[PDB]
Amino acid sequence: MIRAVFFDSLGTLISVEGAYKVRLKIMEEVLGDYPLNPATLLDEYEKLAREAFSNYAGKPYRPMRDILEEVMRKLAEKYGFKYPENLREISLRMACRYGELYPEVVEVLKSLKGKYHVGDILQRDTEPATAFLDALGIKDLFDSITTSEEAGFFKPHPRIFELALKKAGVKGEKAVYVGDNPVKDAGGSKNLGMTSILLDRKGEKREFWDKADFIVSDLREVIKIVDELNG
Numbered sequence: 001m002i003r004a005v006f007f008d009s010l011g012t013l014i015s016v017e018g019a020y021k022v023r024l025k026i027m028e029e030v031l032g033d034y035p036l037n038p039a040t041l042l043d044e045y046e047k048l049a050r051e052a053f054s055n056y057a058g059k060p061y062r063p064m065r066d067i068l069e070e071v072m073r074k075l076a077e078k079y080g081f082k083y084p085e086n087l088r089e090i091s092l093r094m095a096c097r098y099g100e101l102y103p104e105v106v107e108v109l110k111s112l113k114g115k116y117h118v119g120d121i122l123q124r125d126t127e128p129a130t131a132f133l134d135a136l137g138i139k140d141l142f143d144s145i146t147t148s149e150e151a152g153f154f155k156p157h158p159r160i161f162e163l164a165l166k167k168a169g170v171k172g173e174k175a176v177y178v179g180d181n182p183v184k185d186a187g188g189s190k191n192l193g194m195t196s197i198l199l200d201r202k203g204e205k206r207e208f209w210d211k212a213d214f215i216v217s218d219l220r221e222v223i224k225i226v227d228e229l230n231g
Ligand SMILES: O=[N+]([O-])c1ccc(I)c([N+](=O)[O-])c1
Pocket: 022, 023, 026, 027, 064, 065, 066, 068, 069, 072, 087, 088, 089, 091, 092, 128
């Protein structure tokens, strides 16, 4: 049976408008009056961030805030603005202020929490991640919160999933994982026996649906999938 349901909250349950707005507001704060379009800075930042994380996939953990501060230092040198002090404080303030959940998230977590172990699996530094979950109001809706900082390795390394399952006290066969990127999922959770649910809200990832056991566009479909797996 399924006894645990795991999500990637800060990575996949934040609205698309909300995540972009947090990031844009960080760039605007960093730039101040400097004559660079913040949207252009954001685009360049995401490019360099994706590159930097790909270099760390599967590797031993290094604070993500340190990685992103390195990226911002390269951007400051590139465009000529002064490197912002306290970037991680700016970012946490903007996340707490403008972060936004998909509308069905609170309902879904509450509906599951009574009957399953509801867990979060996050590739974030634990302290800002947990503060962000607190600001969003869902921290205490989770039975467990597990991070790459706790596990010691970046995905697709399986240690983070091994730890999340240990916290729930079950083997992977008893657990579902809801994500939006199936490759860092498959490279880890598949070998542990977990059932994978891909969240594809706009149907934009059809070429990866074969890498997932179930595909949904609304998180309220998750309870129906698990309730039925449990007959
Ligand atoms: O998303 N961002 O734009 C962003 C940039 C830099 C940092 I150090 C963070 N942070 O604190 O995680 C976030």
